[PDB]
Each structure stands twice: as C-alpha cells, then as structure tokens.
Design a protein around this nucleic acid. Sequence first.
RNA 1: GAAGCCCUCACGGGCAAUGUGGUGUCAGGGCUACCUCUCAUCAGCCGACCGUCUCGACGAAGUCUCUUGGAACAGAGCGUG
Length: 119
Amino acid sequence: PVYVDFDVPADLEDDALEALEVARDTGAVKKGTNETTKSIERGSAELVFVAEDVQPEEIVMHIPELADEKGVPFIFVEQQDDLGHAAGLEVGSAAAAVTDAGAAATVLEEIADKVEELR
RNA sequence: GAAGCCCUCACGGGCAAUGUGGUGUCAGGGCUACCUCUCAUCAGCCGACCGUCUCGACGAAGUCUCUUGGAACAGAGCGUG
Ligand SMILES: [Mg+2]
C-alpha cells in the first residue's frame, strides 16, 4: 500500500507466479525477506516478488527503492500465501527473489518488461 | 537458510521464510587463504565423603551398720565407680 505505487493486473500476477514455480525447479530462488534483500544487495537477483498483504509493512517497505537503485526488477503479488506456495513453501512469504531463472528466463525477462511498462 | 521445535505410543496434527535451526558474542565475530589444535566453554549422565542439626541404641558403681525422723537423700562408720 504505502510501498505499492502501481497495480499489477491479475493475469500478469499469474504469469509471474507460474514463472516462479518453474524457477524453483529449473533455476534458483530465494525465499524470505532477509534472503531476498541480500540478493538485491549482492546483485544476484533477477526478479523479486513482494506481497501486498504484509503487516507490518515495515518488513518490505525497503524492497522497492532498494531494487530501483540496484537495477533489479520487482513485481507485486496480492496474496502472501500464494507467493510462499509458488516459491515452494508450506508457509507464506512476504518476499521472494528468483536468483537466476530456469526454463523461464524468457517468460521472466518479459514479465520484467511488462512491469517496467506498467510504470 | 528449513538442516528446526511442540503435541501424540502411533497415525496424524500444530508452529516456522514476518526465519525454526546452524554459526557467533572484545581472549570481537563473520567471510577468504592458511597454522595448529581441542581440555575453554556449553549441553546432558552419574553422583558423594566430611561436616552440621535432630533423633535413637548401649551405658560403670551401696540402696550396708548405728542414731534422729512420718519418711534418710541427715549425722557417725564402712565400702564402690
Ligand atoms: Mg546458539
């Protein structure tokens, strides 16, 4: 909400999650806000996901601007439990980072484009 | 970075990426490359002596003489641990 400056259409979010699932199987992904933050800082992040139902918002507030000054692309997901399930967790996840996609580097790279265009 | 914890005989359930657990805590630590090494620390097992306080068992040698007296545990005499 305060850290969300653009709305991601339902369909875009699905493509994103889908890509994330093939990422945990084919490539590499980081689950959890602390491990995600470190990707963006270490530059190893290619696409970071951030839930929008995070309370307190403090936990994720920094992702956006941090991602911006690091060139890393990011996309918002409405449900926290969807991101966690997509990432492969039995629990939810406030943030995730596809650390080097897998059999999705295409669809992925394009999701990053659609979002950059989503302003 | 799920390698973790709780409940339950089990099955099974719950917690946990908003981080369970590993590492680590100024002899600073982590990371990288090395040297040596552990006897520090932490976790868990076993598990007292002595002392002190109280309680309890066992525990030596006269119940002799005369006098006074209601009564000798008194006086005089003899004897014991
Ligand atoms: Mg510890």
